[PDB]
Amino acid sequence: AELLLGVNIDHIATLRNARGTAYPDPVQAAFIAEQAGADGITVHLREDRRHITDRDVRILRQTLDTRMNLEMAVTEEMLAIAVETKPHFCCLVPEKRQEVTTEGGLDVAGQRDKMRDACKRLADAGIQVSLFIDADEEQIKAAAEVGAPFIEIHTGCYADAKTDAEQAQELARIAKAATFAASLGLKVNAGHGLTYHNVKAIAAIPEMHELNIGHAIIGRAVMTGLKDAVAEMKRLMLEARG
Amino acid sequence: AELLLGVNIDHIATLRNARGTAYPDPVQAAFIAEQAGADGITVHLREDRRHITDRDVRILRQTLDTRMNLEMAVTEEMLAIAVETKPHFCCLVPEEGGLDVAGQRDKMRDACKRLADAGIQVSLFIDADEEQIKAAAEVGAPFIEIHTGCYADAKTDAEQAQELARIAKAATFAASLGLKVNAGHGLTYHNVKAIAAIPEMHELNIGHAIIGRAVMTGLKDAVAEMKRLMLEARG
Amino acid sequence: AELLLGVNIDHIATLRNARGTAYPDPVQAAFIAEQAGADGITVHLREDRRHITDRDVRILRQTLDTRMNLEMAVTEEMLAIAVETKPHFCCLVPEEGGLDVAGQRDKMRDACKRLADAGIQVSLFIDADEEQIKAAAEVGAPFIEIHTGCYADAKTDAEQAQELARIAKAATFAASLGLKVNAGHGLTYHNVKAIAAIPEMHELNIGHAIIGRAVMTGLKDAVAEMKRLMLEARG
Amino acid sequence: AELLLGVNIDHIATLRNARGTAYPDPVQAAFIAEQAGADGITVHLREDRRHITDRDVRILRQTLDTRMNLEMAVTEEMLAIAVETKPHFCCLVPEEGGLDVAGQRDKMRDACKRLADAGIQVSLFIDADEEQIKAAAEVGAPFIEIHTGCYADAKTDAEQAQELARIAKAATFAASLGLKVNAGHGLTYHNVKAIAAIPEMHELNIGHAIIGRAVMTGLKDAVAEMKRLMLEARG
Amino acid sequence: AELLLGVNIDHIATLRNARGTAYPDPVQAAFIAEQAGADGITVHLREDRRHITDRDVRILRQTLDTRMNLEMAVTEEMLAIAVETKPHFCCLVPEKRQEVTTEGGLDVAGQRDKMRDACKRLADAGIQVSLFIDADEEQIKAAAEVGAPFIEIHTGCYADAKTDAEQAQELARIAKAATFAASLGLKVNAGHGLTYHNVKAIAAIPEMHELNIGHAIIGRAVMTGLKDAVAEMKRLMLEARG
Amino acid sequence: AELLLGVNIDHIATLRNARGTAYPDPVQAAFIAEQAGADGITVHLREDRRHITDRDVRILRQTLDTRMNLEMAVTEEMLAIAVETKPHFCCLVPEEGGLDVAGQRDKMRDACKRLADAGIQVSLFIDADEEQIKAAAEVGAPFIEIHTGCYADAKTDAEQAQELARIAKAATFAASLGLKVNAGHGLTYHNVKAIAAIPEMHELNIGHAIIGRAVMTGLKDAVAEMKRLMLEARG
Amino acid sequence: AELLLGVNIDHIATLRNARGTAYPDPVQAAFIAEQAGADGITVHLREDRRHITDRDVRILRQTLDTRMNLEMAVTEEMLAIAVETKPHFCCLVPEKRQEVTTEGGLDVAGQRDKMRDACKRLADAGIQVSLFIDADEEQIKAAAEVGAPFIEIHTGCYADAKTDAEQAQELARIAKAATFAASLGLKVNAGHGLTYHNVKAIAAIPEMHELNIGHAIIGRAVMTGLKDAVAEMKRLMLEARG
Amino acid sequence: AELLLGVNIDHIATLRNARGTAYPDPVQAAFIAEQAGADGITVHLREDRRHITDRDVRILRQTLDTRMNLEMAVTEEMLAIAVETKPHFCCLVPEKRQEVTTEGGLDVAGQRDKMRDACKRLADAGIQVSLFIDADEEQIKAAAEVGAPFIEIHTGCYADAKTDAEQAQELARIAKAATFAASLGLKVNAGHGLTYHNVKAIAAIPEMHELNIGHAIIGRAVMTGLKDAVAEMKRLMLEARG
C-alpha cells in the first residue's frame, strides 16, 4: 500500500533524562505522533538506558494505538526483554564495536549463527524482525538467508553526504540495494538520519515499505510542535510517491 | 515590580548534540523566545561544551535582540571568555547546589570586580542561605539568583510551602542588603506562580520546563505561556 | 493562592467504553488537560467500571505530571484500592446527592483516618449544609467539596441566586472550621464565574461541560477557556 | 464521482445523555461536520433512545444542509417514523452482525418498497457475503452497506488482508448486480485507506473514530483529516 | 456581576435571505457565539420577516444553551407570538412612524397605556421586559412607571456621532441617563450600533447590565470568523470594566 | 486546463448596506480573497446600487491586485461605466434566468463590439441552451458563463444529474464554437466539484456560498477551501 | 484614560516601492491593523514620496475605519494637501537640515512664526495638530506658545540607549517632559522607535495619550504577520497601564 | 525532477536598513523559510551594501541548514568574497550601466572574457555558477560558451506584462529559451518578479530546476507571516508540476 512513517521518539526521552524529571514524557509524544501521521512508534531500549527506559516501554506497550518497533542490540538481555514485551516489530542494531560494520549497520554476514537464532527466537514470539544493515549486497543476501523478513537500510551515509555527487552515489547505492533486497523476498525499510530536505529521494524508492525517522522530526518539533513536525514529514513522503 | 523572563536554551543544544548535526539551532530558538515573551536569553557555556558551544555563544552574541546571560563556573578560562564576549549579564555557578561564596570570598571578590570592569552585571547563583546572601553582598555582586531547585523538587505540599517561605524570606533579606534578586532553576508551569508572586524577584531564568513543553507545543507558545503565568502571579 | 482547576476526564472513558476500543484514551486527555490549565486530574472509579477502569487508574498514576484526585464511594474495596494507589487526593462520594456524613460519623471517621494513614488528603463530597460541614470537620477530613449541582440546575434566576448564596455562606462556615473547600460538579462555561468568585474556594473540579466543549473545539482549548474564566472571576 | 463521507454523530449524544444536559448538542456537531468534509450526516434512532432522540431527528431534519442517513431496525415503529421523516437515506440494520436479508426476503422486500414509496433511498447493512448481497439486490434495495467491523477488528495482519480481500470482492459483486455500495462501520484513521481505495465504494459512513479524535482535536479537524485520508487513497 | 454580552444574529439571516437558500443558518451562529463569549442571543422578529423568520425563532428556542432576547414591535401579533414562545427576555422596539421618538427609541412616555399593558401581559407569561428607549429622562421615568424591569438605552447617536465633542456629549448623556435609570430600580442595557472602537466607553458605565450588539460583530465575522469576532468584543468589554 | 476562481463579493456589501456604515468594506474582502485563492474579483453594479456602489467600483479598480469582472445589465448607463472603468472582464447579465441573446442579437452585437473596443473581454451570462450559445458565438462574444442555478437548485439526485449532463454538453458545445466557458452562479462547497470537473470550464465565478461560509469561518479559509475543492475535482 | 495605539504603515510602502509593484498595499495593512488593536493609522507623506504616495493618502482617507494621522513637514504644498485631505490629525515633523534639532525633533522654538501659522491654518481646517519635538523644555514651551494642542515626544534617544543607565536617564527625561507639557495644557503622544521590549515604560507614563509606532511592528509582522504584531503591541501597552 | 524553491530574503534587510536597527534580522527569516518549503536561501551582496551586509553573509553562511545562493556583480572584490565565502551557488547579475542589457539581464555576450574568468575562478573554488540573463538566444549561447553550468532566466518581463497577449508572448519566449538552453547542456533557473498569481506557468516549464523568488513572498509575509508565505508559494509550484 502507501509508504508508512514510523516515528522514533528516543530524543523525547533524551530531553527528559537531561534533568531527571518526568517531562517531557515519551508516552504523550506517541499519542501526538500517532494522530499526526505516524503509522508506528519506534523506541530504542539501550543497555545504558540513556534515554528510553523500561518504564517507557512498559507503558507504551499499553498506550500505543498503532504498533511498536523495538530497536535493540542482539544480546541475551534484550532478546529476553523483547520476547516478553511482544512488540509488533523488532529492529536489530549494532551495540558495541564487534556488532557494527565499517559503515554502521549490523554485521549479519559475519555473524550468521547469532543472527539466525535471534531471528528464530523473536519470530517464535510472534515478532516481525528487521535487520538494520548497510546498503551492502553481502549483508542483504545474508539477512535473507538467516530468515529475517525485513531489513532496514541505514541511510546515514546518504544523509551525511558532504557533496551532491557523494549523495547521488549513495542514493543510487540504496536504490539498487533495495531492488536487490526485494528480489530476495525481503521487505525494506530505511529512515535513519533522514530530514525534511532529503527524505523525498528516499521515499521515492518503490521498494521502501516504512521510513523510520527520529531526530529531524524531534528537532523540528522543539520549534514547531510535534504534531506539525510529524504531519509535515508524512506529507513530504506521500508527495514523493505521488 | 515588572517581572522579567530569561529563557535558558541549553537544552535545544542538548538535543542537537545528541546527533552531531546543526539542528535544531540555538540561534533559531533565541529569536523565537525573544519574540514570545523572553526578555533575555541564557546559555551555560560548560567546560566540556556538552550542549552550548563556543560557536553558539559567538553567533548568539551577534544575533540576540535583547541580551545574553552567560552562565559559567568561576575559572580563569571562563572569566577570560566572559570578558572577551561582554555578555550583558553573567551568572556565576558551581561546576544544596548553590555557589559557595562565603567559603571563597577572595575568589568571588576578584571575579565580580574583573567582570564588573568589563561592564558585565554579575549575579551569584546561591542557596537561599543567609550566610551566602551576606557574603554575596559583602563581595560586591549586584545580583544573586536564588536556587529554586529544592522548592521544585519538594515531595509534599508541606515540604513545598516550607521551601517557598524560605525563598520569600531569603529574597526580602537579600533586597534589604542592596541586592537585586533572581530565581528560576527547576521552575515549571505548575509551580512558577508562587515564585513569581515574590515582590523582590527581578527576573526568573527558566529553561528545561520550557523546552520540555516546546517539544510538544512549539517554543513560541511554550514561552508565551510561561510569561503569561508569571505576569498573572504579580497581577 | 490561585484558584485551582481539577479536570474530571471520566467522560473521555464514557466515549471509549461505548465501543470497546482503546480510543479515545484517558491517558492522552490527562496530558492535554495538565498542559492547558488543569492543576489536577480527577477520575471516578465506579464499582461497575462504567467508564474509568483499573487500567486507567494504574497507568494515570504513572503518567500524571500533576496529581490524582480519586473519586470513590466509601466501601472496603475502594478503600483498599485507594490505600494501594496512594493518589494525592481522594474524594468520597455516595454510591441532594452529597455524602451523609452527619449520620455515619463512625464510618467516615474510620475512612478518613485510614486514607490519611496512607498519606492521602481526604475530601468529603457534601451538600451546602452546615450540619454536614460541621460533621466533616469533626470526623477529621481536611477537605470538603460542596455540591454545586443544585446551583447548576437552578430552573429560575431566583433559585440560582438563592443556591449561590447558600454555597457562599456554607463555604465561609467550612473555612471557619479549618476546612479547605472545593466545588465543581455541574459547573459550566456560563455559570462558573459566580462560584469561582467565592474567596474560600480552593479548587473547582469540573468534568462534563469541559468534555462537552472539547468534542467541538478540542480539549486544550476547552480547558484553557475554563481556567481563564475562573481567573477572571477572581480578579 | 468522488468518494463521499457520511459522519455518524451518535456518540455526540452518548456524551450528552451521560448527564441529561442539552450539551453537547448533535445539532451543532452536524453543522461543523458538514462544513469540514462530511457529505452526509448519519444518526441511529435506537428503540431505547440511548443516544439520538426524536427531538434530535426532528431538528436535524430541519437544520442539515446536506442530507440525513437514518440508521434504523426494520420494525413497524421505525418504518412509520422513517416514512414521516422522509430522510434522504435509510440504512436498515439488525436490532457477523449484518442484516439477515437472505432469510427474510418478504420482510425486507416490504420494507424497501414502503420506504422507496416515501421517496427514501434504502441501504441494507450486510456482511461481505455474496448470498446476502444477491438477496439485497433481489429485494429491490438500491444500496447495501458492507460491514467493515470484522476488517477493523482484525487481530493479525493476515486476518486483515483476508477481510480486506473479502470486502473488495463482495463490493465488485454487488456493483455487477446494479447495487451502489457503502461501508464504514469501525473504520479508523489508520485503516480507512485500504477501504477507500476500493473503486466500487460510494460513501463511507464513519462515526466512533471521528468523535474519539474530536474530543482531543476538535470535530472540524477530525472530519477534515478523515476526508483528506479518504481522498488520498483514491488518488 | 460581570457585564454580559448579548449577540444579535439578525444579519446572519439577512445574508441568508439575500439568496433564499438555507445557509448561512442563524442556528449555527448561535452555537458559535454562545461558546465564544455571548451570554445571550438576540433576534428581532420583524413584521416583514426580512431576516429572522418564525422557523429561526422556533428552532433557536430549542437549541440555545443560554437565553433568547426577542426584539419585537408592540403589536398584537408580536405580543401573542412572544407569549407562546416564552423567551427569557423581550425587548420592545419601534416598528412604524407612530412608534419611535425623534431619535429612534420607543415612545413610552406618550403611550403609557399600551406600554403598561404590553409589559403586564409579557410579564404574566414570565418574560422579563426591556423597553428600548432614547437616553431621555422622560422616557426612563415612564419606563419605570409602566412597570418594565429593564430599559435598553439606544446607543446609536453615540455611535453615529460625527465629532469627538458630539460623542463625548452623547456619552455623558447616556451615563447620566443610566445613573438616573438605576435610581428608579431599573436595570439597564445598551448596545445598538456599538463597535470594536467605541464599545469600551459604554462598557465602563457601571450601571450597564448587558450590551446587546449585532452588526459590528457580524461585520467583523465575515472577515475573521464569528468565534473570534464574539470573543474579541467580549474581551474589550471586560477590559473596560477592568 | 487550470481552473480559475472568481470570487463575487457583492454580499459583503449587502451586509454593509443593511446598516449604512462603512463596514464591512468590500475593498478589504477583495485583498483577503485574492490572497486566499481568488484569481479575480467580481462585483455586480446594479442600477439600484443596492449592494456594490460606485465608490466600491472606483476604489476596487485601484486596489485589486488581480482583475475585475464587472457584472452588469446591458443599458447605455452601464456600458458607459464599463467603458470608463475598463474592467478586465465584463459579464452581461439580465436585470430560465440567462441573458436572452438570441432574442436581441442587434443589442448584444453592439454591446460586445463597444466593450471590446474598450479593451474589455466580454462574457454573456446564458442558460445552457444551444440556441443561446450559437447566438453568443454569432454575436462575437469571447466568453459565455453558463447559468448553474438550475443545477444548484435541483431537488433530487436525478434532476441534479440531468442538469449536470446538460451543462457538460452545453460546455463542450460552446467550446466547439470557439467560445471560452465559465460558470458559477449558485455553486456551493457540496456541488462545486462536479462542475469543476468539466474540462471546458475556464473560470468559476462564485459568491454567496463563499460569503455564507465566511461569516462562520472567515473569508480567507472560505476562499481557500473552495479553491482547494476545485483543483481536487480537476485533479 | 484609555491609552491609544496609532500604527504607522510607512514601511509597507517602503517594501512596495523597492520594486515598483502595487504590493504589498498599505490600504490592506491599514484594514488589518485597525481590526487588531490600532486606534489610528499613521502615514508620513514625504516631499519626495519615498514610500507613502498621494494615491495611498487619497485611498486611505476613504477606507480607514478609524482615523488618519498625517505626518508631514511644514511647507505650503503639504499644508494645502492637509487642508484638502482633512485628516483627523496632523503631526508636523522635520525633513530638511534647517528644520531639525540636534536630536531629531522639530525645531519649533527656532521657527515660531512658521509653526504659528501652520497650527492656525490647520486648525481652521478642523485638524488637530501635533508637533513632533524632543523632550526639551524650550521646545515644549514653544509648542505651547504657538498654540498646538498636542506634542509628540521623540522617544528615539530612549530607544537607542546603549546602557541601562543611559536608558534610565532618557526615560526620566521623557517622563518629566510629559508632566511639564501637561502642566502647560498640552496633550502628549510618543512612539518613534519603540519596540516590544521597551514600550512598557513609556506606556506607563500617565500623561501619554497615544503611542504612534511603526517600524518595530512591521519588522515583527514580516515574521509573524501584521495582525498578531499589532495585537501584541497593543496588549503590552495595556498591561503597562495595568 | 523535483522543482526547487530558493527564497531571496534581501527585502528583510531592506526593511531593517530603513532604520539602522538590528531587526528584522535576515538570519531569522532564513530559518523560517528553510523550514516552510525553501530549498535554498538567496542573498544579493550589493557593492553598496544597500540591504544585505557582510555580517549577514558571514552569519548566514554559518546558520543556513540548506545552502546559500550568493547573487553578486562581477568584480574582483565580490569574486574574492565569493571564493572566501564558498557559497554552494553564485548567481552573477548586472549592477552598473555597462553590465546590464536593455532588458535587465547580465550582458554575457558583450563580456565573454570577464565572464569566462569569473566562471573558471568560481568553479575552482567549488562554486556552481549561474548567469542571470534575458530569455535571449545570443546570451544563452554566450553563457554556454563561457562555461557556466547554469543560467537563470529573467522572468521580469513576463511578470510585468500588461495584457494577456503580452504575457502569453513572454511565457512562450521563456519556455523556448529554457528548452534551447537545455539543448546546450545548461541547467536552467528563473524566478525574478514571480508572484502567487503568475508562478504556475513558469513552474510548469519542465526544464526549470529552481525558482528563486523574493519580493512577492516578503510582500505576502508582511501580511500573513513568512512561514505561510513560503509554504504557499511552494505549494503552488508543486501543484503546477502536478
Which residues contact residue B103 at a Cβ distance below 8 angstroms, ignoring those fewer than 6 apart?
Answer: none
**What is the DSSP code (8-state) at residue G134?**
-
Take residue C126 and report the three cell numbers written for it.
457534601
Take residue B174 and report the three cell numbers written for it.
537579600
Q: CA-based angle E195:E200:E206, to the nearest 5?
A: 130
Take residue D6 and report the three cell numbers written for it.
457520511
- Please give the residue of chain C at the shortest CA–CA distance from B193: C2
Contact of C213 with C225, CB cutoff 8 Å: yes
Domain ranges of chain E: 1-242
Take residue A211 and report the three cell numbers written for it.
521510513
Pick the residue of H12, H63, H226 with the most B CBs within 10 A to test the interface with B by mutation. Answer: H63
* Cα–Cα distance for residue pair D150/B52, rounded to 1 Å: 54
Q: How far is CA H91 from CA G18, G226, H94, H151, in A?
A: 20, 32, 10, 8
H helices present in D91-207, as ranges: 105-117, 130-138, 149-152, 157-176, 192-196
**What is the DSSP code (8-state) at residue D121?**
E
* Cα–Cα distance for residue pair C91/C111, rounded to 1 Å: 11
Residues in chain B: 235
Of F35, F39, F235, the CB nearest to H220: F35
- Helix H or strand E segment including F102: none
Which residues contact residue H15 at a Cβ distance below 8 angstroms, ignoring those fewer than 6 apart?
Answer: G11, G14, G15, G218, G219, G222, H24
**What is the DSSP code (8-state) at residue F189?**
T
- Helix H or strand E segment including B125: strand B121-126
Q: CA-based angle C68:C69:C72, to the nearest 5?
A: 130
Q: Which amino acid does the sequence have at C135? A: A
Phi, psi at C38, each rounded to 5°? -80, 140
Task: For G99-190, list the strands marked E by DSSP.
Answer: 128-133, 150-153, 187-190
- Helix H or strand E segment including A104: none
Distance separating the N- and C-terminal Cα atoms of chain H:
12
CB contact under 8 A, B35 and G197: no
The secondary structure of G75-109 as a DSSP string is SHHHHHHHHHH--SEEEE---STTTB-SSSSB-SG
Binding residues of H: 8, 10-11, 19, 46, 51, 101, 193, 214-215
Structure determined via: X-ray
* Cα–Cα distance for residue pair G130/G90, rounded to 1 Å: 6
Resolution (A): 2.0
* Span A1-242 CATH architecture: Alpha-Beta Barrel (3.20)
Q: In this structure, how many other beta carbons lie within 10 angstroms of the beta carbon of residue D212?
A: 25
Take residue A126 and report the three cell numbers written for it.
510472534
Q: How far is CA G70 from CA C27, G38, G126, G155, in A?
A: 58, 15, 13, 19
- Helix H or strand E segment including H44: strand H40-44
Chain C contact present for D7, CB below 8 A: no
Chains D vs A: touching, with 3+ CB pairs under 8 Å? yes
Distance separating the N- and C-terminal Cα atoms of chain B:
10
Contact of A15 with A26, CB cutoff 8 Å: no
- In angstroms, how far is CA D216 from the centroid of its own chain? 23
Residues in chain E: 242
Taken in order H58, H60, H65, H69, the sign of the CA dihedral is negative
> Residue E195: how many CA atoms within 13 Å on its side-chain side?
22
* Cα–Cα distance for residue pair H215/H209, rounded to 1 Å: 20
Take residue B170 and report the three cell numbers written for it.
531569603
Which residues contact residue G110 at a Cβ distance below 8 angstroms, ignoring those fewer than 6 apart?
Answer: none
Of C21, C24, C217, the CB nearest to D218: C217
* Cα–Cα distance for residue pair G32/G66, rounded to 1 Å: 12
* Cα–Cα distance for residue pair H129/H151, rounded to 1 Å: 8
Take residue B234 and report the three cell numbers written for it.
504579580
Q: Which of D44, D147, D200, D203 is catalytic?
A: D44
> Residue C8, annotated ligand binder?
yes
* Cα–Cα distance for residue pair B54/B72, rounded to 1 Å: 13
Contact of H43 with H26, CB cutoff 8 Å: yes
* Cα–Cα distance for residue pair A40/A33, rounded to 1 Å: 9
Contact of D111 with D79, CB cutoff 8 Å: yes
* Cα–Cα distance for residue pair E35/E230, rounded to 1 Å: 9
Contact of H88 with H68, CB cutoff 8 Å: yes
**Mutual angle of helices G54-63 and F54-63, in 10-degree steps:** 140
H helices present in chain E, as ranges: 10-17, 26-34, 54-63, 76-85, 112-124, 137-145, 156-160, 164-183, 199-203, 215-224, 226-241
Collect all residues of chain H within an 8 Å Cβ-Cβ radius of residue B62.
55, 59
CB contact under 8 A, E197 and G66: yes
Torsion, Cα H54 H59 H60 H66, to 10 degrees, reads 140
- Please give the residue of chain C at the shortest CA–CA distance from B161: C1
3-class secondary structure for B8-58? Answer: ECHHHHHHHHCCCCCCCCHHHHHHHHHCCCCCEEEEECCCCCCCCCHHHHH
Which string of b and e fits B195-228 if b means at least 16 CB within 10 Å?
bbbbebbbbbbbbbbbbbbbbbbbbbebbbbbbe
Pick the residue of F12, F31, F61 with the most G CBs within 10 A to test the interface with G by mutation. Answer: F31
Distance separating the N- and C-terminal Cα atoms of chain C:
12
Collect all residues of chain G within an 8 Å Cβ-Cβ radius of residue H195.
23
* Cα–Cα distance for residue pair G104/G97, rounded to 1 Å: 10
Q: How far is CA D72 from CA D47, D84, D121, E146, in A?
A: 9, 14, 13, 55
Which string of b and e fits G208-232 if b means at least 16 CB within 10 Å?
bbbbbbbbbbbbbbbbbbbbbbbbb
Collect all residues of chain F within an 8 Å Cβ-Cβ radius of residue G23.
65
The secondary structure of G184-219 as a DSSP string is TT-EEEE-TT--TTTHHHHHT-TTEEEEEE-HHHHH
CB contact under 8 A, G15 and H222: yes
Q: In this structure, how many other beta carbons lie within 10 angstroms of the beta carbon of residue A143?
A: 30
Options 3.40.50.300, 3.90.79.10, 3.30.70.20, 3.20.20.70; CATH for D1-235 is 3.20.20.70
Chain G contact present for F19, CB below 8 A: no
* Cα–Cα distance for residue pair A81/D121, rounded to 1 Å: 56
Which residues contact residue E39 at a Cβ distance below 8 angstroms, ignoring those fewer than 6 apart?
Answer: C190, E4, E5, E6, E66, E210
Distance separating the N- and C-terminal Cα atoms of chain G:
12
Phi, psi at H128, each rounded to 5°? -85, 125
Chain F contact present for H165, CB below 8 A: no
Chain C contact present for A165, CB below 8 A: no
**What is the DSSP code (8-state) at residue G110?**
G
| Residue D203 falls in the annotated catalytic set | no
Contact of G134 with G104, CB cutoff 8 Å: yes
Take residue H10 and report the three cell numbers written for it.
534581501
Pick the residue of F12, F32, F65, F68 with the most G CBs within 10 A to test the interface with G by mutation. Answer: F65
- Helix H or strand E segment including E42: strand E40-44
Q: CA-based angle A229:A230:A234, to the nearest 5?
A: 120
